[PDB]
Design a protein around this ligand. Structure first.
Ligand SMILES: O=C(O)COc1ccccc1
Length: 167
């Protein structure tokens, strides 16, 4: 049993809800919240800007020190950092940004990072401001992630479309 409430069950392991991932993290304090990161961990907007704002910029301060030490992530890669006031840990995952020309085949690699964690609160990777088709992102999630994932969809309209179109 876990703390997640009000999710629709899509599969054995994938669950979905219309929710503000920031508000959901604050309420649940999950072991892992996923950030929709970029390779530079520059948390300007979308999920990353909202998560970082909720940490009062502590996420960006930690991220800048991580990049200064390690250099940028790979598209499709991840790193584990603090979850600050939102979660135990933040898994920063870089999905391909279609609005930068990145290969959408990298979306499967991105979601494979989730399998290193038994339970996660996450957004749909490469969805929203990253420019991918969210219906596609949900299909790759379902077909890739084997661990238990709780998906927070920001757009209420999009949530209903994702549910109503799900195979
Ligand atoms: O709903 C999400 O989580 C990402 O996709 C969006 C679609 C429309 C507007 C904002 C986000």
């Amino acid at each position: 049993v876990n703390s997640f409430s009000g999710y629709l069950k899509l599969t054995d392991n994938v669950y979905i809800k219309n929710a503000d991932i920031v508000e959901e993290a604050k309420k649940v304090k999950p072991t892992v919240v996923v950030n929709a990161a970029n390779v530079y961990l520059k948390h300007g907007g979308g999920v990353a800007g909202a998560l970082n704002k909720a940490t009062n910029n502590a996420m960006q301060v930690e991220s800048d020190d991580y990049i200064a030490t390690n250099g940028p992530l790979k598209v499709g890669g991840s790193c584990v950092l603090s979850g600050h006031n939102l979660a135990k840990h933040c898994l920063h995952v870089v999905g391909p940004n279609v609005n930068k020309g990145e290969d959408i085949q990298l979306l499967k690699s991105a979601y494979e990072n989730f399998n290193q964690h038994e339970v996660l609160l996450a957004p749909l990777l490469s969805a929203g401001i990253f420019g991918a088709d969210p219906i596609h992102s949900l299909r790759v999630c379902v077909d890739t992630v084997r661990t238990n994932v709780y998906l927070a969809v920001f757009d209420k309209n999009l949530y209903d479309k994702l549910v109503s179109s799900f195979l």
